[PDB]
């Protein structure tokens, strides 16, 4: 987080992580579409001249408040396909909370596990610890006939029983619940230290 004690402004960063095509961008699109105009900024895509179609997303929002400050949450996604580790590492810098978006399709379980381990490693490689940071897991794509059962998703991907939400990101199932859960965890940490 960045706290400016003179201007009384706090900026928090939430990163949506997970394997290729798992639903990260779709989460932010639904959040943008369904949030009141007065509490959201603009959802934008970003890429660079070096790889102009390697897109990730940025969306600023007003969620909860810390008394005596203006607090804004900046939501980011990452490029989840395996090759793009360097991009994921750039985006994770300064993260305050993480949402791991798992693709419930059975064919994508290995990719879910690879991406979750990559999250843990990348957090360690910038001095963070996944076990301590505000962190919520989303089991997305619950609508698909090849989705793994929720119990099996939990046993495979949520060994520490952190908060978990079923989702269908394009229709909004679970999307705001996931966001509000991680944002509350981040705010609680701000109020602590
Ligand atoms: N059936 C179904 N399709 C979904 C769901 N969530 C996302 N999708 C679809 O999956 C595809 C990829 O979603 P997207 O949100 O773009 O992935 P991403 O995680 O951002 O992917 P990347 O940028 O790391 S490669 C899209 O076609 C989107 O509509 C879901 O819950 N159910
Ligand atoms: Mg995307």
Short mmCIF file of N, CA, C and O in Angstrom, two decimals, residues 13-17 92 95-100 119 123 130 133-137 182 186:
data_model
loop_
_atom_site.label_atom_id
_atom_site.label_comp_id
_atom_site.label_asym_id
_atom_site.label_seq_id
_atom_site.Cartn_x
_atom_site.Cartn_y
_atom_site.Cartn_z
N UNK A 13 -3.48 -2.18 -3.59
CA UNK A 13 -3.38 -2.94 -4.84
C UNK A 13 -3.88 -4.35 -4.64
O UNK A 13 -3.41 -5.07 -3.75
N UNK A 14 -4.82 -4.76 -5.49
CA UNK A 14 -5.33 -6.13 -5.53
C UNK A 14 -4.95 -6.73 -6.87
O UNK A 14 -5.20 -6.12 -7.91
N UNK A 15 -4.34 -7.92 -6.85
CA UNK A 15 -3.97 -8.62 -8.08
C UNK A 15 -4.81 -9.88 -8.23
O UNK A 15 -4.85 -10.73 -7.32
N UNK A 16 -5.47 -10.02 -9.38
CA UNK A 16 -6.15 -11.24 -9.80
C UNK A 16 -5.15 -12.09 -10.57
O UNK A 16 -4.59 -11.65 -11.59
N UNK A 17 -4.96 -13.32 -10.10
CA UNK A 17 -3.95 -14.24 -10.60
C UNK A 17 -4.64 -15.52 -11.03
O UNK A 17 -5.78 -15.77 -10.65
N UNK A 92 2.94 -7.97 -9.73
CA UNK A 92 2.80 -8.32 -8.33
C UNK A 92 3.51 -7.37 -7.38
O UNK A 92 3.23 -7.40 -6.17
N UNK A 95 1.81 -5.62 -4.10
CA UNK A 95 0.46 -6.13 -3.92
C UNK A 95 0.07 -6.12 -2.45
O UNK A 95 0.88 -6.44 -1.57
N UNK A 96 -1.19 -5.77 -2.18
CA UNK A 96 -1.77 -5.83 -0.84
C UNK A 96 -2.72 -6.99 -0.64
O UNK A 96 -2.89 -7.45 0.49
N UNK A 97 -3.37 -7.46 -1.69
CA UNK A 97 -4.21 -8.65 -1.58
C UNK A 97 -4.28 -9.34 -2.92
O UNK A 97 -4.13 -8.71 -3.97
N UNK A 98 -4.51 -10.65 -2.88
CA UNK A 98 -4.56 -11.46 -4.09
C UNK A 98 -5.86 -12.25 -4.16
O UNK A 98 -6.35 -12.77 -3.15
N UNK A 99 -6.42 -12.33 -5.36
CA UNK A 99 -7.50 -13.25 -5.69
C UNK A 99 -6.92 -14.24 -6.66
O UNK A 99 -6.45 -13.85 -7.74
N UNK A 100 -6.93 -15.53 -6.31
CA UNK A 100 -6.54 -16.57 -7.25
C UNK A 100 -7.81 -17.08 -7.93
O UNK A 100 -8.69 -17.62 -7.26
N UNK A 119 2.38 -18.33 -8.16
CA UNK A 119 2.03 -17.22 -7.27
C UNK A 119 2.86 -17.28 -5.99
O UNK A 119 3.42 -16.27 -5.55
N UNK A 123 5.63 -14.41 -5.06
CA UNK A 123 5.54 -13.66 -3.81
C UNK A 123 6.82 -13.81 -3.00
O UNK A 123 7.36 -12.82 -2.49
N UNK A 130 2.68 -15.94 0.64
CA UNK A 130 1.27 -16.18 0.34
C UNK A 130 0.48 -16.56 1.58
O UNK A 130 -0.73 -16.29 1.65
N UNK A 133 -0.51 -12.99 3.42
CA UNK A 133 -1.13 -11.87 2.70
C UNK A 133 -2.64 -12.08 2.61
O UNK A 133 -3.11 -13.22 2.55
N UNK A 134 -3.43 -11.01 2.61
CA UNK A 134 -4.85 -11.15 2.25
C UNK A 134 -5.02 -11.90 0.94
O UNK A 134 -4.43 -11.52 -0.08
N UNK A 135 -5.83 -12.96 0.96
CA UNK A 135 -5.86 -13.92 -0.13
C UNK A 135 -7.19 -14.65 -0.13
O UNK A 135 -7.61 -15.19 0.89
N UNK A 136 -7.84 -14.66 -1.29
CA UNK A 136 -9.12 -15.34 -1.50
C UNK A 136 -9.00 -16.15 -2.77
O UNK A 136 -8.33 -15.72 -3.72
N UNK A 137 -9.63 -17.31 -2.79
CA UNK A 137 -9.64 -18.16 -3.98
C UNK A 137 -11.04 -18.23 -4.56
O UNK A 137 -12.04 -18.34 -3.83
N UNK A 182 -11.79 -10.00 -0.25
CA UNK A 182 -10.38 -9.63 -0.22
C UNK A 182 -10.19 -8.17 0.20
O UNK A 182 -9.25 -7.84 0.92
N UNK A 186 -7.86 -6.69 3.29
CA UNK A 186 -6.85 -5.64 3.11
C UNK A 186 -7.11 -4.49 4.06
O UNK A 186 -6.18 -3.96 4.69
#
